[PDB]
Design a protein around this ligand. Structure first.
Ligand SMILES: CCCCCCCCCCCCCCCCCC(=O)OC[C@H](COP(=O)([O-])OCC[N+](C)(C)C)OC(=O)CCCCCCCCCCCCCCCCC
Ligand SMILES: CCCCCCCCCCCCCCCCCC(=O)OC[C@H](COP(=O)([O-])OCC[N+](C)(C)C)OC(=O)CCCCCCCCCCCCCCCCC
Ligand SMILES: */C(=S)=N/C1=[C]C(S([O])(=O)=O)=C(/[C]=[C]/C2=C(S([O])(=O)=O)[C]=C(N=C=S)[C]=[C]2)[C]=[C]1
Ligand SMILES: */C(=S)=N\C1=[C]C(S([O])(=O)=O)=C(/[C]=[C]/C2=C(S([O])(=O)=O)[C]=C(N=C=S)[C]=[C]2)[C]=[C]1
Ligand SMILES: *[C@@H]1O[C@H](CO)[C@@H](O[C@@H]2O[C@H](CO)[C@@H](O)[C@H](O)[C@H]2NC(C)=O)[C@H](O)[C@H]1NC(C)=O
Ligand SMILES: *[C@@H]1O[C@H](CO)[C@@H](O[C@@H]2O[C@H](CO)[C@@H](O)[C@H](O)[C@H]2NC(C)=O)[C@H](O)[C@H]1NC(C)=O
Ligand SMILES: CC(C)CCC[C@@H](C)[C@H]1CC[C@H]2[C@@H]3CC=C4C[C@@H](O)CC[C@]4(C)[C@H]3CC[C@]12C
Ligand SMILES: CC(C)CCC[C@@H](C)[C@H]1CC[C@H]2[C@@H]3CC=C4C[C@@H](O)CC[C@]4(C)[C@H]3CC[C@]12C
Ligand SMILES: CC(C)CCC[C@@H](C)[C@H]1CC[C@H]2[C@@H]3CC=C4C[C@@H](O)CC[C@]4(C)[C@H]3CC[C@]12C
Ligand SMILES: CC(C)CCC[C@@H](C)[C@H]1CC[C@H]2[C@@H]3CC=C4C[C@@H](O)CC[C@]4(C)[C@H]3CC[C@]12C
Ligand SMILES: CC(C)CCC[C@@H](C)[C@H]1CC[C@H]2[C@@H]3CC=C4C[C@@H](O)CC[C@]4(C)[C@H]3CC[C@]12C
Ligand SMILES: CC(C)CCC[C@@H](C)[C@H]1CC[C@H]2[C@@H]3CC=C4C[C@@H](O)CC[C@]4(C)[C@H]3CC[C@]12C
Ligand SMILES: CC(C)CCC[C@@H](C)[C@H]1CC[C@H]2[C@@H]3CC=C4C[C@@H](O)CC[C@]4(C)[C@H]3CC[C@]12C
Ligand SMILES: CC(C)CCC[C@@H](C)[C@H]1CC[C@H]2[C@@H]3CC=C4C[C@@H](O)CC[C@]4(C)[C@H]3CC[C@]12C
Lengths: 516, 516
């Protein structure tokens, strides 16, 4: 019955995933007919869009607009639509992550140094990724995901959430660096491409709009859980908590006419970011020069790195989202989700568009947005395809709705990203055990890993996971940032080999439990 | 045993107050030997000082510096020292209020129009106030305070707290009016007397410093009540919650060198605000011209208004602070506190210094700062004289410590005033019953006025008290602002005559309870 059981039949996992979820397909339309779904669509849209605008911007900077915002928005939309319809876990938000950006920047620098075309280089990586994922899904390689315990899951989940929060603050700090609090400013600053010098009030208003949006979001989260107003209205206001926080703080910025704040910019229409470099279809054999056969074969090694990058990112996100603690009854498919996400990425490369992955924060945020809460415990989860479908479509239609987005500050969305980052820590026993380091040992909750485990041994087990978070944080920073997925895999040996030397069996079963 | 019992002996109340509290005088020194007292001294100092600086500023503006900051600081200090030593309730913070400011502005305009000297006019009001309070304390007029129920007490307490919060926001809004968010500014702005035009970043940083100080204060309030850190450290950090909030946000402003924020300004030394107008001793018979005998006698009617103003302000503040719900075991004296506060005010007028009153928010704030909490319930209150003594001394020594105060923003203190205003609503059944209007009728607490009172009749009783708050708010704004104490007294008839026509006896006993 379990998803991560090795069947024996070639593509046995893929079919057993399709046989499981597609029976509840009519449910996946009708379960979306609630207002909490509509609220989630508006929330996850901005969570989905702004990274595509940002990473797209960076891609445009890093690769001389050979790939950019236009290409990433279109990829995010088409893969998002297809995955929402055909996927095993529609709650996964498919998009572009940092580790994928680090590879594009790395692969561009390679392609430059060796004097071989970059965008056609990615097509061949794409073909290898299609070859690998079919081979992996054929022999049910996603069974190995079962060995990835809560230990590795939470270290990953917690790290990703911390980095999200860090980068959200790094974005705010940057505004203060570009628009410092000076005594005097140049009243003449060209604003066509970007502010050409520091401006008054921009940095502090950015802080106020971020702080304000985060505050309101967290108060309407608290109001939802409170016992104020009629229950019907209390949920309607509460579920539309984030959309309401955005609307009012967007309106607050709109009425402030004189002060400048950075808004969401999108391309004018649907065209490639550099028309002189490429078209909509990338030629394998080459665009200008002859693409060499040495790299056509050698592209396997980059593709094997990209596979490991998408796989762990996506399969650990599928583990976190489809865990027994949450009320996911429809069922998850680790084989069909891997096949589409990695498969589409390969075909996306053929059109010069970026391959994507089930991103951890956006997926958790989207799942957490569709969870109805009782009392505190989770009653059920609104598992349906329409949230993801409509989000993916809106990202597609973001170019058409420029007049709407052009009056939405980034500062506002930075408040929502902070809310996303904080909220993502909720269902993580690592973060729970980190707060127990500060609580005295007579205020710890009545849980399995407190009653029949010694408090100093609990804290040692927590301490070892911090040392793993610390080591993983140093890697992502250093030039060995694409080696972080391999460092995270090394936490499986740590749990399976080393921890049972210092700890006993009973302690590890209670600390690292599959279901609690 | 009760304080508000009419004895029969002339000055029977005054002596029975002295006989009650002075036995516990050695306790009133030794009970101050805790860190929560030191924390309260630092907190209430800024709560005490900044109004004396502000109202002193306004007095300097309203009366051509015939009375100003110097005079008010010295009055606040000398009356504060004397009252801390000799008073019946040392928890009362004696200072200058708005209703007293409205009288000075009103009496100045009179004294101008009729062409009689203002500062000597106040001396004669002062003599009438000494005559009245002695007469009132002789025949134990403070017995009438017993008829002032929770009904009037809470309407007053709630109104004063709302106005405090409103005026705190009015102060912030004014910074945005003087330093608007413009596209362009004049890089040349003389700053000697005050900014001579709008400046960039001042208004938003003011908002950030206010919001920041309020946030930190409310989080260290929450941290105190939480179950984090060792209990010893948890209280030390919690009880120094407001001082810590001020220190860090003062340091945050200190490291920002380029941006301008308004700081606490004090006089250079101890001299009268206008030396050409007056000296340190005001002559009854006159300074320049002959003071007419018509007003020497007619000053009774202004003095009778000032008496009613100080009495209700101070005696209702003594009721609110020394209520049975709180753990005030040392005992309060309504006769001795009235004698000193009004008496000193009369003698203060002879030196050209403003008469004061037991102010509601500062007194409650000071009382709330010295309450130790259990678990949620109040264990005891740190009733001692040293808090009030040291606060009064620090206000006296504020002129000497200009270098310390000159680097404290007002924006920071605006965050503390917001914290004071919110925190003052805690022990008010009116505010509690206001929140029940929004809560559904199956989430109301298990209290006497919910179980055996119909929910629609509770809300009607709450509604009638809002209409009183509304009527009182209109009076404070209109030119009949000195008629507000009389409008508040009319809420006694309302409770004693009108409410028992629409309500039953049992309902009023449960809604308006002396002890709950
Ligand atoms: C735990 C609580 C922590 C607080 C978190 C809050 C984060 C910060 C968010 C602030 C709200 C956003 C304000 C936008 C800035 C306004 C700019 C503007 O144009 O306004 C100009 C206006 C008026 O100025 P004006 O420029 O229009 O005036 C005209 C100008 N002349 C005269 C030149 C023509 O000012 C304001 O609106 C006042 C300031 C903003 C509102 C204050 C918000 C409250 C913040 C205080 C702390 C929190 C309060 C908590 C209370 C409840 C208890 C929980
Ligand atoms: C309930 C949640 C509500 C929280 C909001 C509370 C009210 C708002 C308080 C805001 C904090 C103000 C402190 C910063 C003051 C400005 C600093 C400045 O100007 O210095 C310049 C510095 C920048 O350094 P710099 O200017 O020296 O850089 C050099 C410049 N050049 C390159 C030109 C030479 O500013 C900063 O440090 C960045 C801003 C810090 C902001 C702090 C984070 C607050 C985020 C919003 C609120 C949400 C947080 C919640 C997190 C916890 C979860 C509960
Ligand atoms: C914003 S949007 N800015 C932003 C956000 C992210 S995010 O949301 O993907 O965390 C990043 C990427 C940071 C990151 C790295 S990187 O780029 O520092 O090497 C590595 C990993 N490792 C893994 S798995 C995670 C995140 C940048 C900018
Ligand atoms: C600042 S600090 N300045 C300030 C402070 C206050 S207060 O007293 O709330 O700290 C006020 C409000 C004065 C006030 C009035 S008045 O003068 O505005 O009519 C009336 C009443 N009603 C009664 S009793 C109380 C206070 C203004 C400015
Ligand atoms: C479009 O792509 C081409 C190729 O990178 C860029 O054209 C080159 O620009 C670089 C830097 O100036 C120089 O090598 C030459 O000017 C061009 N030669 C090449 C390699 O084509 C162009 O900069 C790109 N434009 C965008 C939109 O990024
Ligand atoms: C000091 O007090 C005197 C009296 O108010 C002020 O001097 C007068 O100013 C008023 C208003 O302009 C006019 O009557 C004359 O200009 C002055 N004659 C007097 C003595 O009345 C003086 O402005 C005050 N200074 C301060 C510090 O406020
Ligand atoms: C683009 C920026 C300005 C943010 C946009 C957010 C908008 C679309 C959000 C904010 C508040 C939202 C509304 C809040 C509450 C309800 C009641 C519900 O029964 C139907 C939907 C409805 C009527 C929502 C529709 C969408 C809404 C208007
Ligand atoms: C482009 C990428 C994403 C997909 C390429 C197509 C290949 C690899 C996949 C797509 C769906 C797959 C099929 C799905 C279901 C079955 C039924 C099973 O009883 C035998 C295998 C078989 C017939 C699979 C064979 C391989 C298959 C055809
Ligand atoms: C499901 C429905 C609503 C579609 C949603 C996605 C839409 C908005 C997006 C996804 C990808 C987009 C296409 C991408 C590329 C091109 C080629 C260009 O030469 C003309 C526009 C065209 C054809 C775009 C039109 C809009 C498009 C079809
Ligand atoms: C090695 C360092 C630099 C890594 C940084 C993480 C720090 C904060 C971690 C690593 C090891 C951890 C310690 C490991 C073991 C114990 C014993 C326990 O009874 C109390 C907590 C305590 C004392 C931990 C506190 C947190 C700790 C000090
Ligand atoms: C004037 C501005 C900068 C604010 C001044 C606040 C200062 C005086 C406050 C803020 C934090 C305070 C400290 C916080 C904690 C303690 C521990 C206690 O066991 C003794 C007092 C002591 C050491 C306090 C002394 C006073 C203190 C330093
Ligand atoms: C500050 C101003 C008002 C103080 C002066 C007011 C005068 C009238 C007050 C101050 C102290 C008072 C005395 C204090 C104590 C006693 C003892 C008692 O057994 C009889 C009354 C008697 C003798 C009081 C009479 C009134 C009194 C003399
Ligand atoms: C209890 C101790 C610490 C005293 C505290 C209050 C001190 C700081 C204040 C209160 C009133 C003040 C006095 C008020 C008036 C004058 C007259 C002037 O011509 C010289 C200064 C002098 C004499 C002041 C000196 C400082 C002073 C004495
Ligand atoms: C200045 C204005 C606000 C003065 C009027 C005060 C308002 C808030 C008061 C006056 C009478 C009150 C109503 C009296 C009775 C009831 C019935 C109860 O089952 C629900 C609340 C409700 C409907 C009250 C709501 C609040 C109310 C409307």
């Amino acid at each position: 019955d379990d998803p991560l059981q090795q069947t024996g039949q070639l593509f046995g996992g893929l079919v057993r995933d399709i046989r499981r979820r597609y029976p509840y397909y009519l449910s996946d339309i009708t379960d979306a007919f609630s207002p909490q779904v509509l609220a989630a669509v508006i929330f996850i849209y901005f969570a989905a869009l702004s990274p595509a605008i940002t990473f797209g911007g960076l891609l445009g900077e890093k690769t001389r607009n050979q790939m950019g915002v236009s290409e990433l928005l279109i990829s995010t939309a088409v893969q998002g639509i297809l995955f929402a319809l055909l996927g095993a876990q529609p709650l996964l938000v498919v998009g572009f992550s940092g580790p994928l950006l680090v590879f594009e920047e790395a692969f561009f620098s390679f392609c430059e140094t060796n004097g071989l075309e970059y965008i056609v280089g990615r097509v061949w990586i794409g073909f290898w990724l299609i070859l690998l994922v079919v081979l992996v899904v054929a022999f049910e390689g996603s069974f190995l995901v079962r060995f990835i315990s809560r230990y590795t899951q939470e270290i990953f989940s917690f790290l990703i959430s911390l980095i999200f929060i860090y980068e959200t603050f790094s974005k705010l700090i940057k505004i203060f660096q570009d628009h410092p609090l000076q005594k005097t400013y140049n009243y003449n600053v060209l604003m066509v491409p970007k502010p050409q010098g520091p401006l008054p009030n921009t940095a502090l208003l950015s802080l106020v709009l971020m702080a304000g949006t985060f505050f309101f979001a967290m108060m309407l989260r608290k109001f939802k859980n409170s016992s104020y107003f009629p229950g019907k209205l209390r949920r309607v206001i509460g579920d539309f908590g984030v959309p309401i926080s955005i609307l009012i703080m967007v309106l607050v910025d709109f009425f402030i006419q004189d002060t400048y704040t950075q808004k969401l910019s999108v391309p004018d229409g649907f065209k490639v970011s550099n028309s002189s470099a490429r078209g909509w279809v990338i030629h394998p054999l080459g665009l200008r020069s002859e693409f060499p056969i040495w790299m056509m074969f050698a592209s396997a090694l980059p593709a094997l790195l990209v596979f490991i990058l998408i796989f762990l990112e996506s399969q650990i996100t599928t583990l976190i989202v489809s865990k027994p603690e949450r009320k996911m009854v429809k069922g998850s498919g680790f084989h069909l989700d891997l096949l589409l996400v990695v498969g589409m990425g390969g075909v996306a490369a053929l059109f010069g568009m970026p391959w994507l992955s089930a991103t951890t924060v956006r997926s958790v945020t989207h799942a957490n947005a569709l969870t109805v809460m009782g009392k505190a415990q989770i009653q059920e989860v609104k598992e349906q395809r329409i949230s993801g479908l409509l989000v993916a479509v809106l990202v597609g239609l973001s170019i058409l709705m420029e007049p709407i987005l052009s009056r939405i500050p980034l500062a506002v969305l930075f408040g929502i990203f902070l809310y996303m980052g904080v909220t993502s820590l909720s269902g993580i026993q690592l973060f729970d055990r980190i707060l127990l380091l500060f609580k005295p040992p007579k205020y710890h909750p009545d849980v399995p890993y407190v009653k029949r485990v010694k408090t100093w041994r609990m804290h040692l087990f927590t301490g070892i996971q911090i040392i793993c978070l610390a080591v993983l944080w140093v890697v992502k920073s250093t030039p060995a940032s694409l080696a972080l997925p391999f460092v995270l895999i090394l936490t499986v040996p740590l749990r399976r080999v080393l921890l049972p030397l210092i700890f006993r069996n009973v302690e590890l079963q209670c600390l690292d439990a599959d279901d609690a």
